[PDB]
Amino acid sequence: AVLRRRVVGAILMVLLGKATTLALPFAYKKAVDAMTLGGGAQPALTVALAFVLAYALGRFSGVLFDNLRNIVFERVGQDATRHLAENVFARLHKLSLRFHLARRTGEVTKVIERGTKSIDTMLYFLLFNIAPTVIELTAVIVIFWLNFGLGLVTATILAVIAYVWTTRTITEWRTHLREKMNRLDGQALARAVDSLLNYETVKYFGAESREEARYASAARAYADAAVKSENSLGLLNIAQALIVNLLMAGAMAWTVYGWSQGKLTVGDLVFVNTYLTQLFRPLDMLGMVYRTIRQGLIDMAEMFRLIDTHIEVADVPNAPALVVNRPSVTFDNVVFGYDRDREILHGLSFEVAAGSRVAIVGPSGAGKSTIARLLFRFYDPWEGRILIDGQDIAHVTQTSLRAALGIVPQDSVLFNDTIGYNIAYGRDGASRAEVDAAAKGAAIADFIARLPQGYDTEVGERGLKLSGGEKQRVAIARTLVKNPPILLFDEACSALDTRTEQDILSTMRAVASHRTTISIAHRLSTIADSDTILVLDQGRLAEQGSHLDLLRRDGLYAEMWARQAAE
Amino acid sequence: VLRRRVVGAILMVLLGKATTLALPFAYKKAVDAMTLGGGAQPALTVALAFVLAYALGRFSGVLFDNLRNIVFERVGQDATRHLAENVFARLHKLSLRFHLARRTGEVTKVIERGTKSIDTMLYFLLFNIAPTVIELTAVIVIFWLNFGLGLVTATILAVIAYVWTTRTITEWRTHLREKMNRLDGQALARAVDSLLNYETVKYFGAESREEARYASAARAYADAAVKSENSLGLLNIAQALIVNLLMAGAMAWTVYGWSQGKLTVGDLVFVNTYLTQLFRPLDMLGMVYRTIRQGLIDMAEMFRLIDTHIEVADVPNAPALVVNRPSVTFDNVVFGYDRDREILHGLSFEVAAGSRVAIVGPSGAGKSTIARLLFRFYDPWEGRILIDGQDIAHVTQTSLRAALGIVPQDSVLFNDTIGYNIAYGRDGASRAEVDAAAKGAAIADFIARLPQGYDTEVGERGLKLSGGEKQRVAIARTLVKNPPILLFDEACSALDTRTEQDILSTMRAVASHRTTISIAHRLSTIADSDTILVLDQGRLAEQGSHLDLLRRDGLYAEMWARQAAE
Ligand SMILES: Nc1ncnc2c1ncn2[C@@H]1O[C@H](COP(=O)(O)OP(=O)(O)OP(=O)(O)O)[C@@H](O)[C@H]1O
Ligand SMILES: Nc1ncnc2c1ncn2[C@@H]1O[C@H](COP(=O)(O)OP(=O)(O)OP(=O)(O)O)[C@@H](O)[C@H]1O
Known part of the structure; x- marks a missing residue:
């Protein structure tokens, strides 16, 4: 590639994103490392500056890394979208005549736009979610394994298995609803576009009210389908939040059972609670990632099945050219x-x-x-x-x-x-x-x-x-x-x-x-x-x-x- | 008929505010038990209080967010349907010269952008205009009654700097957003015109020319989008700089109050919890203002293209055409x-x-x-x-x-x-x-x-x-x-x-x-x-x-x- 250095820099920015969740526990570890009145006279200003620096600079570096990786990746993402659009246009012109004669413009436009947008978001979220979440969860499991907490890692892996099973089931449910939602959206747009192409016909016969009524029916059907799909999304979200919050409550209860007033180790209590506050996000994100991947895969499969239907007219392998000397x-x-x-x-x-x-x-x-x-x-x-x-x-x-x-x-x-x-x-x-x-x-x-x-x-x-x-x-x-x-x-x-x-x-x-x-x-x-x-x-x-x-x-x-x- | 639904949604918003205000109250009671001698019963109760407060508070926050979403889905989709119906109607009300000389791709792009933007506009409106007022008024009143005077002045000055920077960078971004939308519309219109002439393209075998021209339009749109998103990232980093500087300044002020201890047992705790609760609204309000600006200009453009004075208009209270002998x-x-x-x-x-x-x-x-x-x-x-x-x-x-x-x-x-x-x-x-x-x-x-x-x-x-x-x-x-x-x-x-x-x-x-x-x-x-x-x-x-x-x-x-x- 010519822009491999660009994607290398993007991956480097992703790795730098780890620095914020690396510096977040450092403040707590340095504070608890001092038992009581740590650095009373002189190092009090130092620990105050450490708190301020950690907090502010960590949040600023996180947001700055997000925006910088976005800025540097925009060029590559838009080039990928342009190549995809050109190839879609080309393969669309390669289709047969029966298709273009019996086609429905609105449904095809909806399918093409959905495919392009969803594939672009897939291309982003693959490299921006799959890697950092895996790295973070593996690091957390290793940190909990090297410590005396053995029931912690087993409970975590079992709860994650239950989480992904529930996410899988509710995602199947959401897919069931999304199929109907997408069908109704495509039909509504196709009806509207067909009504718009017959503008002269509508005016000749004065049927504006009829077109409005039929489009309204299609739109309210699509609206009901979308409401149902979003309610299923909210149910998946609350189930995932229940699992995440129960895991966090169990970890907090274990760390308080370790010692009520004090702490088991220096870092244990603070490190664990801060890592819960940092970990509630990747667990919430993994379900969304599975959902987005499933939906994008199914819609891109639909688009590529509609596009790659075998063209009726296809040249024979090693076919010659038409030489016309006496045109008959x-x-x-x-x-x-x-x-x-x-x-x-x-x-x-x-x-x-x-x-x-x-x-x-x-x-x-x-x-x-x-x-x-x-x-x-x-x-x-x-x-x-x-x-x-x-x-x-x-x-x-x-x-x-x-x-x-x-x-x-x-x-x-x-x-x-x-x-x-x-x-x-x-x-x-x-x-x-x-x-x-x-x-x-x-x-x-x-x-x-x-x-x-x-x-x-x-x-x-x-x-x-x-x-x-x-x-x-x-x-x-x-x-x-x-x-x-x-x-x-x-x-x-x-x-x-x-x-x-x-x-x-x-x-x-x-x-x-x-x-x-x-x-x-x-x-x-x-x-x-x-x-x-x-x-x-x-x-x-x-x-x-x-x-x-x-x-x-x-x-x-x-x-x-x-x-x-x-x- | 669904006013009761949005009332319930606002009530759910208020319950989310109740959770976000009860978290620092729970922390204040925690510190009240830190300085006060406990025992078996108080230690058990404060452990239960920590676990309950933390877990149930975050769980109730996420649950209230999703319930607001679920309750608002119906009203939002009905609003989108009503908007689409009215747009379709007014689109059919246009004259014939328009529909004859139109370019389908750009008009479709404008209509879709307006329709998909107005829903998010109404959402962020109902989720920002009310909560921002409530939060800022409560915080300013608490800092004026209990806390000092320099705090509110520093906060107001930082907000003034934030809104000035947002104003300047949004003025900068308007040109780029307009150029991006224009190029996107032109590219889509060119593609649609190419597809409508499918029979012509096949008759003359000019697929390569159509592909090349569409590729030119698409790369122009890609460059415009790259510039627009880079300017967006610049606004985002400027807003993040202002927000993190204000948060660091507030933390530094509460550490200057007293290094080892606190001037008031509730002062530093309330301020740090308020920072941890305000870092999200401050990050969201800038994005919301940007989205509102862009959606408003898009909707104004759409309604300017739609409400162009229709060429044929019946004279006020004109009678019916009575046809007895049709000539x-x-x-x-x-x-x-x-x-x-x-x-x-x-x-x-x-x-x-x-x-x-x-x-x-x-x-x-x-x-x-x-x-x-x-x-x-x-x-x-x-x-x-x-x-x-x-x-x-x-x-x-x-x-x-x-x-x-x-x-x-x-x-x-x-x-x-x-x-x-x-x-x-x-x-x-x-x-x-x-x-x-x-x-x-x-x-x-x-x-x-x-x-x-x-x-x-x-x-x-x-x-x-x-x-x-x-x-x-x-x-x-x-x-x-x-x-x-x-x-x-x-x-x-x-x-x-x-x-x-x-x-x-x-x-x-x-x-x-x-x-x-x-x-x-x-x-x-x-x-x-x-x-x-x-x-x-x-x-x-x-x-x-x-x-x-x-x-x-x-x-x-x-x-x-x-x-x-x-
Ligand atoms: N896509 C299609 N699917 C089914 N039938 C088709 C299709 N295209 C053409 N036909 C059929 O072919 C016939 C029309 O072809 P033909 O060449 O006779 O039209 P034409 O001679 O231009 O008509 P006219 O002389 O009436 O203007 C019709 O019987 C029509 O049903
Ligand atoms: N929408 C339009 N925009 C610009 N010029 C138009 C438009 N419609 C018609 N004209 C012009 O008006 C003139 C009248 O053409 P008209 O459409 O009456 O052709 P016609 O005489 O009915 O058909 P034919 O030329 O086959 O006999 C033509 O020169 C045409 O170019």
Whole structure:
């Protein structure tokens, strides 16, 4: 390590923490060492100064060592928290698409925050509690063993065994309550966040009172659970305090039975009572430490089980890269369903040669966007296989496949940033020439120009500050900056007017020559000039061929095109 | 109802004070038996008294602390719940510009910090404000009656130095705490924005860039937190220095009273026991003042972000919107989102009752802006909107928003079943209404064919459903609401022409007294509308039937010739 000297200094400060509980009994030992009127004339000032120094300097050194070890350890602790956060973020982005589609934001946020905070406190308390408490208790047991007190050490170890057994049982009880408390907290936050994401929906339907009521129910449930958990905590604390105070009372009774008025040895009475006043804290701390360790272990196990769920899409060991010389797309008996109970895509097989401009039309919910998701290997198909340039998709690394094609999604999402940043996100470090070329290609050059502070205009969350047509155009500009050999369009021009769509199609036909392009849309006025059209229905390829051919065959595509041309 | 509970808690506090005041009384009786000749009975009684006093006193202290905690748990959790409910409510009371331009991470961080700080504020308030007053008044009275005058003056001067040092170091720490909170919020907001674009990140393969940017934000936050905690440690060591110096000074004063003996048998004993009982409140009060300061500034910031003057506010005691003949009128309406860019200038048109009107025009001409303005999301700069000859601004927001049902361009669904989304149209919607709306939006057979159909999860924002299925569900919600005015904003953009014709056929077959507004680009969907409004540069350029507009050889004729060209 590079900061090993830092943790060494922290451990040294911990060891120096022993100095306060070492100097505390020294005052009593020096005072009782003098029997009566110890140092009457001259050493009276000396013993007074010894008392003052011991007390004040010991307490000050204890607090000073605590704050100094905290200050020196802050850097290491925050670096550990930052590394943990980065790795959590990374592994979170590595998760599958089914998760991010069916997730609940509030519960995940609560679990992640609880895991981070609890693991940090674990990392602190391990080295700050386990070592000093063990050292202190062992030193006390050794001091009591070297003395004539033999029943003392046996009673102490038996009482500590009873203490840890009771702490274990009540900690199991507290864990039982904490599970319900955490469940209710997660549900309450998830309900609130979902209510907040549907703000426009709530306002459209005027159901603010209903959202408030449901969140209130979740919150009062969580409040009751927390009250019960804290009462169990208080019960554990009073049981631990009972055991500790009974041990201290027994030690005091033994030391008074030794000699009522006097003391057995010089140090015995004072040393024992001062060590009880110093030892009531480690015994109270050990139960809290066991509780914190148990709870942190269970919550970190929950987080790492939720995070390390096997990602559905995983590259084969020593998988090659996707080499695209002639970009073709082939589906070979591809059968897929999102869940096992509903088969979405049935036996589907089709071919898309290089340089072709192919269309995929069909009814609502027939699985065209499913074809788009499968081509990008978001889900592995049940049967059959997908091929790009005669190469299987699953048998190739995800990185090369996903970089070799650029898809415009049906519902686009934009970063809360300027239009310029969103457009330049297409490729890392995009030159302004590429950005301007994509803006002119996507029909936003005139629009951004007419905007005040145009390229720096904020688009808001998910790009909702822009219009539908503008958002679609920005998505097309991103995918144009990416410049893939295969450019997929998923209902991109649904919000655009016909003029902008005609302009952008003319641009694409004017420049794009070597790209294989597949487009899926419902308004058939946009794809009637495609090379071939695929009519998809109930997840099966029903018709395939040119627009004129499909219109002459008097099939489903001809029916849909006659239905659209009706006024 | 739970005032009796906090009364009992204060009584438990008083019992803890009784134990802390009976400990030095027990020690004073111990010394009374030290100077007085004892015997068998007195020796037995003083041994029993030492053991009982010590053990039962510490046991009662810890037990009273835990019992105060247990008794206060209920009231504290109810207070936290009430605060959370009011925060949630006032958060939903905000305007649309806020929720559109917000950054989720920083707002969530601010709300969580405020909520988790107010509980501890109320706790330390009820555990410090009362006991500090009681302790300081009792100690000052005892030192003034029995003890000397220099004692209280030295104590007050040390307290003045302590509070001055706390003031200075807290002034120093405010900047660092503010910087730490700002950086934490920015980092979390960046992470949340990265996660919301998960599909985008996967489409462009920019995980490394997102990780690097988040790492930058996180290391900035880490440096800020290190500085803040170091300043905290400096305040703590300064406070500890002052406290230990005062304790050493008091002990030195009582040893100066008499080295070997005591001036009064109770004087030195009371002072040393009072030091051993006051070292804890002095250590706690500085931390409590710091926590109170930070929580107060956090709560002030939260309520400043929440209580920003809401843009849309109903006029005082405004009447209800009475709708007998539902019409929509725009009268010289001039509006822009930002002051520098005027979106909609000089627009005036009429939509009579029972008509099926369309709003067509170029991209970004302000159609969805018309939808936003009709629902009173923003007040217009000039002009006015009228419903049934009644102004919108002079009417309550609730009645207006209930009088209209809007299908948005971008629909959003709760992470719940299809049944819950459809039933959201009206409070406590009967399943007959849900089935009727499902039949109206052409989903009855679809939901039937689904396994566990009505209970099928739609995921967050309904992304587990298709585009067309999602649009149909939005239409079903708006049909369940059953408003007199039905606005559609690009609702059937994802549907095929067959489903759109089926749902329009159903609606025209049933809907007779409904006023319908439609916004679309695909003119095959609105070519049978009663009237069409051509919107251009934020102005009504053409109005009339499809045949009329196509005969006038205008802008609509150009658009319909461009769409019908293949
Ligand atoms: N929240 C907002 N912040 C800033 N500008 C906005 C906001 N909402 C809309 N606009 C702007 O107002 C203008 C009107 O756009 P509008 O949303 O009406 O698009 P539209 O015409 O309905 O959709 P399309 O462009 O697809 O036809 C656009 O230029 C848009 O950029
Ligand atoms: N996560 C999921 N879980 C279950 N089913 C899913 C999921 N994602 C998609 N589907 C199913 O796939 C189908 C939608 O895919 P498809 O590509 O047909 O939508 P689409 O063509 O965009 O719809 P439309 O044409 O109606 O806009 C639906 O039947 C839907 O239930």
